[PDB]
């Protein structure tokens, strides 16, 4: 009964979706995330999995504010000035 019959008792999930990383790895009993460590203030990151690091980096997602900062840099972060009107 080690195999197929044992597989019939899968009816209570262990992990749920994390509210920080978005992956389904937030352990309920441990109350911690196995993908990014949500309760820990520092993002889980190890150098022995380069692929895992690359899957979620600075350039992976939207870069909602950073890409705006990139195009502001080429003008030197101007503030308070507008082009002359017609």
């Amino acid at each position: 009964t080690k195999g197929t019959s044992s597989f019939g008792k899968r009816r209570n999930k262990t992990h749920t979706l994390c509210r920080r990383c978005g992956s389904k790895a937030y352990h309920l009993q441990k109350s911690t995330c196995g993908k990014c460590g949500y309760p820990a203030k520092r993002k889980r990151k190890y150098n022995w999995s380069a692929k895992a690091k690359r899957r979620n980096t600075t350039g992976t997602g939207r870069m909602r504010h950073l890409k705006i900062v990139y195009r502001r840099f080429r003008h030197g972060f101007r503030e308070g000035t507008t082009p002359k009107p017609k």
């Binding site: 900062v69 972060f77 503030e79 308070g80």
Partner: protein, 122 residues
């Protein structure tokens, strides 16, 4: 017709508000027409009304914030949103006045021994 922002800035706040609500009413009834199922004229006009609403809100916000910073132009402590939003490192950087401050020791050192302009014959 085609509402544009050039003639909206001169309008006062209450008139802009009493135009914005009418735009909201027209957008709502256009949405009702879309759900019921009508001609493509209302469907096309939905985008126009939404952009007109966006442009009116933009003008209202620009005038409001311009008046706010005009009010806080001369004061020493100004609200954070009105403060210049540059990079965090640049804000934490010392200002030109502080970085230009020079102690009396190096002031008199430069006084007594300035960098001269010299040349040597071949």
């Amino acid at each position: 017709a085609k509402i544009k922002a050039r003639d909206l800035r001169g309008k006062k706040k209450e008139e802009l508000l009493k135009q914005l609500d009418d735009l909201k009413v027209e957008l709502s009834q256009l949405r009702v027409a879309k759900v019921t199922g009508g001609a493509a004229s209302k469907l096309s006009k939905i985008r126009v009304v939404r952009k007109s609403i966006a442009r009116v809100l933009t003008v209202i916000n620009q005038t409001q914030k311009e008046n706010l910073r005009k009010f806080y132009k001369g004061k020493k402590y100004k609200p954070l949103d009105l403060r210049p939003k540059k990079t965090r490192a640049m804000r934490r950087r010392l200002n030109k006045h502080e970085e230009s401050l020079k102690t009396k020791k190096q002031q008199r050192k430069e006084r007594l021994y300035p960098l001269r302009k010299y040349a040597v014959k071949a």
